[PDB]
């Protein structure tokens, strides 16, 4: 139940706002300024504000904090959503999200805002189906938003029927100083681009341990995929009834499910990383980085930063494989590979220079995080067994996937 | 070709299972 | 060795404090690698930018060796800068300053009358407790010249000697006697605000 | 890459080199530092801060950099410590009381594991009194042989003359330089 | 005696700052920002003089960035203003038509004005032509 | 801008 | 400007009017008080054009409650244009007609939002849904005599389930003004009517498809049952705010299951995916998060009460997020895993935000405090922790160790020895107290106790209040176990309280200790040197009352504050 949807800026300027409900002073925005200025120098800075009776809950844009004003007791996760929504729908209209397009597409935005909330509840956020009634470049509505299926809009065609799907994996470790391994969690994501004609419904099928289970298969390899959250395209009925995947894709590049599971599995990179760090002398980076993963597999782009001490001059890298750098702007050591074969082990002695006087606060410890992205490996062995493209009209589609490992919250903590 | 690894052919449904 | 007005150009092209730090890193890192090569030539200007970054509001302790170098130099440009980095980043404090009494002490009966200047001013600027109890013999003696431009600038190096050190008001009472006939008013003012600090 | 350069400029010679002067308080350092830049015995205060110039001398540039024994002082020497290769100890065999301690402050800088490449260089310095001992019983008091991996040479050098210092000098030279 | 002096910017940047007191580098940070909250939280007619924490902080500003200096309970307060005004228009004859530019790329030459002009807190020249020459002399020394 | 103005304006 | 703008308002060139309505647009964009010409764009309102007169409303609905007087030169444009076949126009006209918030307006606007309330345009009636609540917020006695609430009921009756829900997040907008009566619920048949359009509504349709419910008891199981069939679909959901409504929904229809079913089981087991689906949302989002799950998790603790590892806190994570995770910890800390907890507060002691180390002091403290098995380890890890010399870390580690001592000093006597040599000039006030009372209350294992508190003793006239009195009752208490060594400490200390001592509640204090010295020194050991029974421990765990009402309201920002609904608006 949001009151009023303002941009601001990084200088406390309002670029744009639109009020929906009128229930609080336009002018309270100027002490939002001042509020956020003193709870971050206090520790007590939160994106929900609160300016007497009025809260101010908002997130943090790539320039804009998109604060939304407050009286009553609303409801602070629609208002989350619908925040989001709309950084969504801003990211598909205009390619950046800077200070350039909210002073230059103004004649649109007004249009956008107004369409997709009225009274502080949003009614409209597909941006596919929002670009057929607000254009910066009109007709009535399309059926597809009174219609139920408002993902999908009628009369789609296409020379061909392609399907392009993106099965990228997130490996998030939390590996302690100790040595062992805390939060290892895999995340999975099926991102697909579909362009097919007419309204056609997907039937997925993969290799899901409760489906081999109910089949009666459950002896080979199955995906335990812990927590399943499909998009709005994918019946929760379906779902729930029979584990059955029945959803219409939309037009374009969107997120279908995303799976979510433990792993108790080896990490794929060992990082045995050492500092021998002289008291105001010098340091020894005995870094060693051992590939768990398979020899089949090359993890592209390997860059496993390692933070080095802030004040840290002279460098020298010492290693095996891979370009070093170290860059002052993040203060880290970037052990940058690009080709890393399975099982393959780099070993690096990292030597640096200290000043003689000491630092008059402490700095923390960052954790070192490595970038690996090893294409075409599953580590959760999940793998997509079908996808049924049923038409009204008849179609032959032509469906593709492709398998992205990468590195999630691939973080070691240091000693 | 494509960084990530090469897109790959689905299939229909189960055709193991009817 | 890039220059402090390039530096600020460049600082003045940052609009996020979190890429102004990267910025500002971005040429602290070069500054580091400079001095740890024991530059000799481009020194100023890295002096200068590491002032302008700690003004900034960032950290410059490693940059508090060089300064104490510079200072005792034969260059004035490099004199000058290891002046103001001695009154800007030193302090009483810093536990560092020690080491430049020595330097003060030097440039103390140097013929030029502005590097014995900027040792004075530094010295009235960032008087330490232990300082001035090993400045003050030759402080006395620049007191007693018959140099204008020396005169204000030794009333005032007594003057913050004695807010320093209260206790050594007794060796300059012989030495202010019958200074009152300056007929530049620099040197009256100094020789009165002395009295009225005495 | 082409260092031709670098080779033209080595033959008239490109190596300068450095130095340390390091050691107790009234142990003659400046005297002798004076008189290796000058040639005259200067009289000068005790050194409050410290003394940093340069010889020229077998085409290498010797930066000497000389450091009081001060109390508040002694624990300043981790300054220098920073791009630093050559390293001086100035001994005073005058004071029997503080050869405890200059031996105990050398061995407190000698305990560092940053200063590994600078090589020993003892200097024996008050070298007009008849009670000063001869170049091995200093050593033998200090164990200057129970230096591993430390190229120490004792040296008598006379504040007042000067003997001995040309040998000093020609031998850092050859501990620095290994060609010809 | 002058505490500190402190030029800060309208927008709450400080372009120069001297202070005569050893104090602590995280205090001399939070004083400085005490002091452009307080300067920047006052209107056009509160006098241009705040006692903050017993100290006189006189504020006068003669463009978009301001002034600032502390002088102890124990002296004039017009007496701080004429000095302000003297180094204003001795920065304005030393350069030349000063400006906001020419402070923050020529803040060297502003620190070694305020030295050859005001040491520890108090005056070194009263005229304001000598040390003019002075500092030219300095300059042209190389 | 409000920057290159002068000072006092003299 | 103002002038050559008007002109080109008045013209007679369509090239023209775009472009003045265009820069009267950015000029209130860029903060420009242009209310001065209201007036002069209502002659420029009725045109073809559809990209100006949404500029015209909009200028309207911003320049609406500064002119009401001129405002009065549009009911007949909204009324004409309330009628244009094409759905666009009317859909903004009665969202422009709702905006203005003008009390002499809203009275003859009731004629078109009538007209509109059936209209076959589903963007028309989802447009006229809100409208009806809009205008209802402005006048409430106006919709009731139009009455437009048996016209809302009608349509969460009818089909287009987007219109459906609009009218549903409309009538639960009224009815939440509204004082209970005439209450729109409806019977099962409503619900299971709703639930039929629940998996057809959008993505917002949802959430107001699923708010209804929270109002409404269900009376049995069977009812119960079908309803929890239906919501637990809603946990595989991309919206994080649906999964958080679903999981509001199912927690209050809990209050009516019966646990000896299978039922709560599948229940409890199909939420805690959810939960856990929910922590890895956006940050923004972690805090609501940390929030419902730390206000469900009072209620039924047997859920998550597997989940500990997802709850560390990240390195990137921020520090609204850091806060709760330690909260979220504690509030899950058990035996089973004491030792991770234990590892994980060691290493959010190495930080350097001096709030987030004070926070995983007092939850190690809580920790410690919860659990009595892990009482060792908790206190060698405050011991290793004060062995690493850190001001603020040996500051929270003084309180911890304090408090720990009151709780379990049973077996605490091997650590005062370490304790003794602290490097006990810390100044902090909580901490000297502290340290203060374990040195008194503790003055056994320790030999040197009355040395230690001689460096005390120098200035207790002006240390502080709190100090003050710690140091009092540790000086009585030597006094009262170990006379000998402490018999003039206790006369200078009750000269020193007494005489130069001007705190009431001091002096008070200090007049009844030497009463009680003077009295009978005997007596003393059984009156102040006395077994004080168990301490009460601070339960966190909120009131029952509070925390039923504060199920209901469940992602709202009554549940963040953990504050009553009514306690924080206005
Ligand atoms: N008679 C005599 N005295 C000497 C001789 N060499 C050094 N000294 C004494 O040693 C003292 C040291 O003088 P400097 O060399 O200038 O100072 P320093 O050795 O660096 O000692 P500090 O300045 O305190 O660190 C002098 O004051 C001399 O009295 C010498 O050859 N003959
Ligand atoms: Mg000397």
Redesign the pocket.
Same mark, same amino acid.
């Given at each position: 139940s949001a009151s009023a949807v303002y941009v601001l800026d990084l200088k406390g300027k309002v670029l744009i706002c639109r009020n929906y409900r009128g229930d609080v002073d336009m002018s309270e925005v100027e002490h939002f300024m001042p509020i956020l200025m003193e709870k971050e120098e206090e520790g007590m800075l939160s994106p929900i504000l609160a300016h007497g009776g009025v809260r101010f809950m908002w997130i943090k844009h790539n320039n804009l904090y998109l604060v939304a004003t407050s009286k009553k007791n609303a409801c602070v996760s629609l208002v989350f959503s619908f925040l989001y929504k709309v950084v969504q729908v801003f990211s598909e209209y205009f390619k950046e999200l800077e200070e350039e397009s909210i002073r230059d597409n103004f004649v649109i935005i007004y249009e956008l805002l107004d369409e997709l909330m009225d009274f502080g509840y949003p009614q409209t956020t597909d941006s596919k189906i929002l670009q057929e009634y607000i254009t910066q470049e009109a007709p009535r509505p399309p059926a597809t938003v009174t219609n139920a299926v408002s993902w999908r809009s009628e009369g789609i065609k296409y020379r061909k029927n392609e399907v392009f799907l993106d099965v990228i994996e997130a490996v998030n470790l939390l590996v302690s100083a100790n040595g062992n391994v805390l939060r290892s969690e895999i995340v999975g994501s099926i991102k697909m681009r579909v362009f097919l004609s007419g309204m056609p419904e997907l039937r997925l099928g993969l290799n899901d341990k409760v489906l081999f289970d109910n089949t009666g298969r459950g002896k080979s390899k199955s995906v335990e995929l812990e927590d399943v959250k499909f998009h709005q395209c994918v019946r929760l009925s379906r779902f729930e009834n029979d584990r059955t995947i029945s959803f219409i894709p939309p037009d374009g590049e969107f997120e279908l499910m995303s799976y979510r599971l433990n792993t108790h599995v080896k990490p794929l990179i060992w990082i045995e990383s050492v500092i021998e760090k002289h008291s105001h002398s010098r340091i020894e980076y005995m870094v060693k980085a051992k590939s768990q993963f398979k020899r089949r597999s090359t993890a592209n782009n390997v860059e496993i930063h390692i933070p080095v001490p802030n004040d840290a001059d002279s460098p020298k890298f010492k290693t095996t494989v891979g370009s070093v750098k170290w860059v002052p702007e993040n203060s880290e050591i970037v052990w940058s590979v690009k080709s890393f074969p399975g099982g393959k082990e780099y070993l690096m002695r990292a030597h640096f220079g200290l000043p003689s006087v000491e630092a008059e606060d402490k700095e923390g410890k960052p954790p070192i995080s490595v970038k690996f992205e090893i294409p075409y490996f599953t580590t959760s062995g999940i793998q997509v067994r079908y996808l049924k493209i049923i038409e009204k009209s008849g179609y032959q589609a032509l469906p593709w996937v492709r398998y992205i490992t990468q590195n999630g919250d691939y973080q070691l903590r240091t000693q | 070709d494509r960084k990530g690894g090469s897109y790959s052919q689905a299939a229909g449904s189960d055709s193991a299972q009817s | 060795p890039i220059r402090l007005r390039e530096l600020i150009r460049t600082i003045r092209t940052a609009r996020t404090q979190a890429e102004e730090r990267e910025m500002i890193q971005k040429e602290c890192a070069a500054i580091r690698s400079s001095f740890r090569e024991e530059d000799n030539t481009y020194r100023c200007r890295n002096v200068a930018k590491l002032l302008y970054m700690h003004m900034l509001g960032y950290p410059a302790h490693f940059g508090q060796l060089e300064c104490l170098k510079l200072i005792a130099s034969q260059k004035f440009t490099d004199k000058r800068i290891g002046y103001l980095g001695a009154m800007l980043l030193l302090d009483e404090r810093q536990d560092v300053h020690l080491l430049m009494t020595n330097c003060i002490k030097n440039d103390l009966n140097h013929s030029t009358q502005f590097v014995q200047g900027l040792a004075l001013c530094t010295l009235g600027c960032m008087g330490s407790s232990e300082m001035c109890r090993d400045l003050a013999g030759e402080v006395e003696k620049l007191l007693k010249t018959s140099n204008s431009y020396l005169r204000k600038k030794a009333a005032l190096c007594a003057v913050h000697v004695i807010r320093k050190v209260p206790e050594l008001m007794e060796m300059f009472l012989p030495a202010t006697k019958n200074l009152l006939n300056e007929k530049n008013h620099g040197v009256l003012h100094t020789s009165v605000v002395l009295l009225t600090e005495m | 890459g082409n260092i031709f350069a670098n080779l033209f400029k080595g033959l008239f010679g490109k190596k300068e080199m450095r130095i340390l002067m390091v =050691? $107790?308080?009234?142990? =003659?350092?400046?005297?002798? $530092?004076?008189k290796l830049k000058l040639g005259e *015995? /200067?009289?000068? *205060?005790?050194?409050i801060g410290f003394?940093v110039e340069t010889v020229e001398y077998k085409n290498i540039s010797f930066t000497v950099w +000389? /450091? @009081? @024994?001060?109390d508040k002082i002694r624990p300043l020497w981790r300054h220098y410590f920073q791009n630093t290769q050559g390293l001086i100890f /100035?001994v005073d065999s005058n004071d029997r009381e503080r050869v405890n301690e200059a031996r105990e402050e050398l061995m407190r800088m000698l305990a560092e594991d940053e200063l590994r490449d600078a090589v020993l260089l003892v200097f024996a310095?008050?070298? +007009? $009194?008849p009670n000063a001992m001869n170049a091995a019983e200093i050593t033998d008091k200090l164990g200057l042989h129970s230096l591993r991996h430390r190229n120490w040479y004792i040296q008598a050098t006379?504040?007042?003359?000067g003997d001995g210092l040309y040998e000093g000098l020609d031998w850092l030279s050859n501990q620095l330089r290994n060609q010809k | 005696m002058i505490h500190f002096i402190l030029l800060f910017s309208r927008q709450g940047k400080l372009r120069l700052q001297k202070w005569y007191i050893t104090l602590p580098d995280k205090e001399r940070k939070k004083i400085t920002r005490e002091i452009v909250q307080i300067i920047l939280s006052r209107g056009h007619r509160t006098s241009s003089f705040v006692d903050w924490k017993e100290l006189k902080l006189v504020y006068k500003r003669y463009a978009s960035l301001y002034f600032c200096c502390a002088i102890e309970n124990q002296d004039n307060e017009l007496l701080t203003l004429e000095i302000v005004h003297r180094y204003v228009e001795l920065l304005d004859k030393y350069f030349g038509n000063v400006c906001e530019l020419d402070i923050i790329f020529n803040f060297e030459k502003a620190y070694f004005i305020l030295d050859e002009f005001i040491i520890g807190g108090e005056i070194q020249e009263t005229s304001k032509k000598i040390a003019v020459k002075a500092i030219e002399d300095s300059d042209m020394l190389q | 801008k409000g920057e290159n103005t002068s000072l006092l304006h003299p | 400007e103002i002038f050559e703008l008007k002109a080109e308002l008045n013209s007679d060139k369509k090239e023209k009017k775009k472009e003045a309505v265009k820069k009267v647009i950015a000029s209130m964009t860029v903060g420009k008080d242009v209310s001065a010409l209201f007036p002069d764009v209502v002659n420029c309102m009725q045109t073809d054009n559809l990209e100006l007169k949404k500029l015209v409303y909009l200028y309207l609905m911003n320049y609406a409650k500064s002119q009401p007087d001129m405002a009065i030169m549009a009911v007949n444009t909204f009324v004409k244009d309330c009628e244009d076949p094409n759905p666009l126009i009317r859909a903004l006209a009665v969202r422009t007609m709702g905006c203005i918030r003008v009390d002499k307006i809203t009275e003859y606007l009731c004629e078109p939002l009538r007209k509109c309330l059936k209209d076959e345009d589903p963007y028309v009636r989802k447009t006229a849904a809100v409208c009806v609540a809009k205008l209802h917020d402005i006048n409430a006695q106006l919709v009731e005599d139009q009455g437009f609430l048996d016209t809302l009921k009608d349509l969460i009756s009818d089909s287009n389930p987007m219109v459906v829900a609009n009218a549903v997040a409309a009538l639960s907008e009224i009815a939440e003004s509204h004082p209970s009566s005439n209450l729109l619920d409806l019977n099962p048949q409503s619900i299971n009517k709703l639930l039929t359009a629940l998996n057809e509504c959008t993505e917002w349709g949802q959430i107001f498809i699923l708010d209804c419910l929270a109002n409404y008891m269900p009376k049995d199981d069977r009812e119960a049952q079908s309803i929890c069939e239906r919501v637990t679909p809603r946990l595989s959901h991309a919206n994080s705010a649906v999964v958080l409504s679903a999981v509001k929904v199912l927690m209050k229809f809990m209050e009516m299951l019966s646990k000896d079913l299978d039922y709560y089981g599948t229940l409890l087991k199909k939420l805690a995916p959810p939960l856990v689906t929910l922590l890895s949302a956006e940050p923004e989002l972690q805090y609501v998060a940390l929030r419902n799950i730390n206000l469900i998790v009072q209620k039924r603790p047997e859920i998550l009460k597997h989940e500990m590892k997802v709850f560390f806190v990240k390195y990137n994570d921020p520090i609204y997020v850091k806060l709760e995770k330690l909260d979220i910890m504690i509030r899950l800390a058990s035996q089973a895993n004491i030792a991770q907890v234990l590892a994980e507060l060691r290493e959010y002691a190495t930080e350097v935000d001096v709030d987030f180390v004070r926070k995983a002091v007092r939850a190690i403290g809580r920790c410690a405090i919860k659990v009595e098995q892990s009482a060792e380890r908790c206190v060698s890890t405050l011991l290793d922790l004060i062995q690493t010399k850190v001001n603020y870390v040996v500051q929270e580690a003084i309180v911890v160790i304090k408090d720990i001592f009151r709780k379990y000093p049973n077996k605490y006597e091997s650590v005062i020895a370490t304790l003794c040599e602290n490097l006990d000039s810390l100044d902090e006030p909580e901490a000297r107290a502290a340290m203060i009372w374990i040195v008194g209350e503790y003055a056994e294992r320790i030999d040197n106790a009355d040395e230690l508190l001689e460096s005390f003793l120098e200035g207790f006239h002006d240390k502080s209040t709190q100090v003050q009195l710690q140091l009092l009752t540790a000086i009585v208490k030597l006094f009262l176990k170990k006379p000998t060594e402490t018999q003039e400490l206790v006369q200078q200390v009750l000269s020193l309280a007494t005489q130069d001592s001007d705190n009431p509640d001091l002096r008070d204090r200090g007049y009844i200790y030497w009463r009680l010295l003077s009295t009978d020194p005997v007596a003393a050991k059984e009156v102040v040197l006395a077994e004080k029974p168990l301490i009460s421990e601070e339960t966190d765990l909120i009131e029952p009352t509070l925390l039923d009402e504060l199920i209901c309201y469940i992602g709202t920002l009554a549940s963040v504050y953990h504050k009553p609904p009514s306690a924080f608006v206005e």
């Amino acid at each position: 139940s949001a009151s009023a949807v303002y941009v601001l800026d990084l200088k406390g300027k309002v670029l744009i706002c639109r009020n929906y409900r009128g229930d609080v002073d336009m002018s309270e925005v100027e002490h939002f300024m001042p509020i956020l200025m003193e709870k971050e120098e206090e520790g007590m800075l939160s994106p929900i504000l609160a300016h007497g009776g009025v809260r101010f809950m908002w997130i943090k844009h790539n320039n804009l904090y998109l604060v939304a004003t407050s009286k009553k007791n609303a409801c602070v996760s629609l208002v989350f959503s619908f925040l989001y929504k709309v950084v969504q729908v801003f990211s598909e209209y205009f390619k950046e999200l800077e200070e350039e397009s909210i002073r230059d597409n103004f004649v649109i935005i007004y249009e956008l805002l107004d369409e997709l909330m009225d009274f502080g509840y949003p009614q409209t956020t597909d941006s596919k189906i929002l670009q057929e009634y607000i254009t910066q470049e009109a007709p009535r509505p399309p059926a597809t938003v009174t219609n139920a299926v408002s993902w999908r809009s009628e009369g789609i065609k296409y020379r061909k029927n392609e399907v392009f799907l993106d099965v990228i994996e997130a490996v998030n470790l939390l590996v302690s100083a100790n040595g062992n391994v805390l939060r290892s969690e895999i995340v999975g994501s099926i991102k697909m681009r579909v362009f097919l004609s007419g309204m056609p419904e997907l039937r997925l099928g993969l290799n899901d341990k409760v489906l081999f289970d109910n089949t009666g298969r459950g002896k080979s390899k199955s995906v335990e995929l812990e927590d399943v959250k499909f998009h709005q395209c994918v019946r929760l009925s379906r779902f729930e009834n029979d584990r059955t995947i029945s959803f219409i894709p939309p037009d374009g590049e969107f997120e279908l499910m995303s799976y979510r599971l433990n792993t108790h599995v080896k990490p794929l990179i060992w990082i045995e990383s050492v500092i021998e760090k002289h008291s105001h002398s010098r340091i020894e980076y005995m870094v060693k980085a051992k590939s768990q993963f398979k020899r089949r597999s090359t993890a592209n782009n390997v860059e496993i930063h390692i933070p080095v001490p802030n004040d840290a001059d002279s460098p020298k890298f010492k290693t095996t494989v891979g370009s070093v750098k170290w860059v002052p702007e993040n203060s880290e050591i970037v052990w940058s590979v690009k080709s890393f074969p399975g099982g393959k082990e780099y070993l690096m002695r990292a030597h640096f220079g200290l000043p003689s006087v000491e630092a008059e606060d402490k700095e923390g410890k960052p954790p070192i995080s490595v970038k690996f992205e090893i294409p075409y490996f599953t580590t959760s062995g999940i793998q997509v067994r079908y996808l049924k493209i049923i038409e009204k009209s008849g179609y032959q589609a032509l469906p593709w996937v492709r398998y992205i490992t990468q590195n999630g919250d691939y973080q070691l903590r240091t000693q | 070709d494509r960084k990530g690894g090469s897109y790959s052919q689905a299939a229909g449904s189960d055709s193991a299972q009817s | 060795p890039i220059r402090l007005r390039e530096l600020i150009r460049t600082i003045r092209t940052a609009r996020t404090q979190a890429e102004e730090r990267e910025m500002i890193q971005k040429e602290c890192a070069a500054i580091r690698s400079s001095f740890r090569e024991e530059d000799n030539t481009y020194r100023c200007r890295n002096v200068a930018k590491l002032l302008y970054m700690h003004m900034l509001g960032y950290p410059a302790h490693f940059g508090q060796l060089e300064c104490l170098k510079l200072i005792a130099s034969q260059k004035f440009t490099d004199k000058r800068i290891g002046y103001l980095g001695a009154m800007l980043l030193l302090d009483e404090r810093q536990d560092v300053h020690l080491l430049m009494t020595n330097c003060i002490k030097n440039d103390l009966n140097h013929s030029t009358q502005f590097v014995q200047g900027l040792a004075l001013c530094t010295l009235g600027c960032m008087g330490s407790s232990e300082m001035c109890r090993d400045l003050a013999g030759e402080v006395e003696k620049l007191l007693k010249t018959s140099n204008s431009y020396l005169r204000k600038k030794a009333a005032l190096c007594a003057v913050h000697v004695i807010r320093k050190v209260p206790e050594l008001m007794e060796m300059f009472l012989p030495a202010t006697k019958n200074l009152l006939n300056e007929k530049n008013h620099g040197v009256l003012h100094t020789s009165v605000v002395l009295l009225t600090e005495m | 890459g082409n260092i031709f350069a670098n080779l033209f400029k080595g033959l008239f010679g490109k190596k300068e080199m450095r130095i340390l002067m390091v =050691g $107790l308080d009234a142990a =003659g350092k400046t005297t002798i $530092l004076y008189k290796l830049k000058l040639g005259e *015995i /200067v009289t000068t *205060i005790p050194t409050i801060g410290f003394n940093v110039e340069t010889v020229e001398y077998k085409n290498i540039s010797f930066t000497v950099w +000389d /450091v @009081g @024994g001060q109390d508040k002082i002694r624990p300043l020497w981790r300054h220098y410590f920073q791009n630093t290769q050559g390293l001086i100890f /100035v001994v005073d065999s005058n004071d029997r009381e503080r050869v405890n301690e200059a031996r105990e402050e050398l061995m407190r800088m000698l305990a560092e594991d940053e200063l590994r490449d600078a090589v020993l260089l003892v200097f024996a310095n008050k070298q +007009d $009194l008849p009670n000063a001992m001869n170049a091995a019983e200093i050593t033998d008091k200090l164990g200057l042989h129970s230096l591993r991996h430390r190229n120490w040479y004792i040296q008598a050098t006379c504040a007042t003359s000067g003997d001995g210092l040309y040998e000093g000098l020609d031998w850092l030279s050859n501990q620095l330089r290994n060609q010809k | 005696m002058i505490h500190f002096i402190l030029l800060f910017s309208r927008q709450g940047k400080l372009r120069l700052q001297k202070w005569y007191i050893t104090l602590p580098d995280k205090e001399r940070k939070k004083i400085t920002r005490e002091i452009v909250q307080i300067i920047l939280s006052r209107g056009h007619r509160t006098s241009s003089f705040v006692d903050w924490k017993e100290l006189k902080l006189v504020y006068k500003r003669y463009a978009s960035l301001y002034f600032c200096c502390a002088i102890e309970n124990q002296d004039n307060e017009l007496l701080t203003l004429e000095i302000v005004h003297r180094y204003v228009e001795l920065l304005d004859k030393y350069f030349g038509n000063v400006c906001e530019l020419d402070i923050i790329f020529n803040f060297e030459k502003a620190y070694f004005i305020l030295d050859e002009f005001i040491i520890g807190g108090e005056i070194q020249e009263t005229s304001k032509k000598i040390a003019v020459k002075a500092i030219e002399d300095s300059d042209m020394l190389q | 801008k409000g920057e290159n103005t002068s000072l006092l304006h003299p | 400007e103002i002038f050559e703008l008007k002109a080109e308002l008045n013209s007679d060139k369509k090239e023209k009017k775009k472009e003045a309505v265009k820069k009267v647009i950015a000029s209130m964009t860029v903060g420009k008080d242009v209310s001065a010409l209201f007036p002069d764009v209502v002659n420029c309102m009725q045109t073809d054009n559809l990209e100006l007169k949404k500029l015209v409303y909009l200028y309207l609905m911003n320049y609406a409650k500064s002119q009401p007087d001129m405002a009065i030169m549009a009911v007949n444009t909204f009324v004409k244009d309330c009628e244009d076949p094409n759905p666009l126009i009317r859909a903004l006209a009665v969202r422009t007609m709702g905006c203005i918030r003008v009390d002499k307006i809203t009275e003859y606007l009731c004629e078109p939002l009538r007209k509109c309330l059936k209209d076959e345009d589903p963007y028309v009636r989802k447009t006229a849904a809100v409208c009806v609540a809009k205008l209802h917020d402005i006048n409430a006695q106006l919709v009731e005599d139009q009455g437009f609430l048996d016209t809302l009921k009608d349509l969460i009756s009818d089909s287009n389930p987007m219109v459906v829900a609009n009218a549903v997040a409309a009538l639960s907008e009224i009815a939440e003004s509204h004082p209970s009566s005439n209450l729109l619920d409806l019977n099962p048949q409503s619900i299971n009517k709703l639930l039929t359009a629940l998996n057809e509504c959008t993505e917002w349709g949802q959430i107001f498809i699923l708010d209804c419910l929270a109002n409404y008891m269900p009376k049995d199981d069977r009812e119960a049952q079908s309803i929890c069939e239906r919501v637990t679909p809603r946990l595989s959901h991309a919206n994080s705010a649906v999964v958080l409504s679903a999981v509001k929904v199912l927690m209050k229809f809990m209050e009516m299951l019966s646990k000896d079913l299978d039922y709560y089981g599948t229940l409890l087991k199909k939420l805690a995916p959810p939960l856990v689906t929910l922590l890895s949302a956006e940050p923004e989002l972690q805090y609501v998060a940390l929030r419902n799950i730390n206000l469900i998790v009072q209620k039924r603790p047997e859920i998550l009460k597997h989940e500990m590892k997802v709850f560390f806190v990240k390195y990137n994570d921020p520090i609204y997020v850091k806060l709760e995770k330690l909260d979220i910890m504690i509030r899950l800390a058990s035996q089973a895993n004491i030792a991770q907890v234990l590892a994980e507060l060691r290493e959010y002691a190495t930080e350097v935000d001096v709030d987030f180390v004070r926070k995983a002091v007092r939850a190690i403290g809580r920790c410690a405090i919860k659990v009595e098995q892990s009482a060792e380890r908790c206190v060698s890890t405050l011991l290793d922790l004060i062995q690493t010399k850190v001001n603020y870390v040996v500051q929270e580690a003084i309180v911890v160790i304090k408090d720990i001592f009151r709780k379990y000093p049973n077996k605490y006597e091997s650590v005062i020895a370490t304790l003794c040599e602290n490097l006990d000039s810390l100044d902090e006030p909580e901490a000297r107290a502290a340290m203060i009372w374990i040195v008194g209350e503790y003055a056994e294992r320790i030999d040197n106790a009355d040395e230690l508190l001689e460096s005390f003793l120098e200035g207790f006239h002006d240390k502080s209040t709190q100090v003050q009195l710690q140091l009092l009752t540790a000086i009585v208490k030597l006094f009262l176990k170990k006379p000998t060594e402490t018999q003039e400490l206790v006369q200078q200390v009750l000269s020193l309280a007494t005489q130069d001592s001007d705190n009431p509640d001091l002096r008070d204090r200090g007049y009844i200790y030497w009463r009680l010295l003077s009295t009978d020194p005997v007596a003393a050991k059984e009156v102040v040197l006395a077994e004080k029974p168990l301490i009460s421990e601070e339960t966190d765990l909120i009131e029952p009352t509070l925390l039923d009402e504060l199920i209901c309201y469940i992602g709202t920002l009554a549940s963040v504050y953990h504050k009553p609904p009514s306690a924080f608006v206005e």
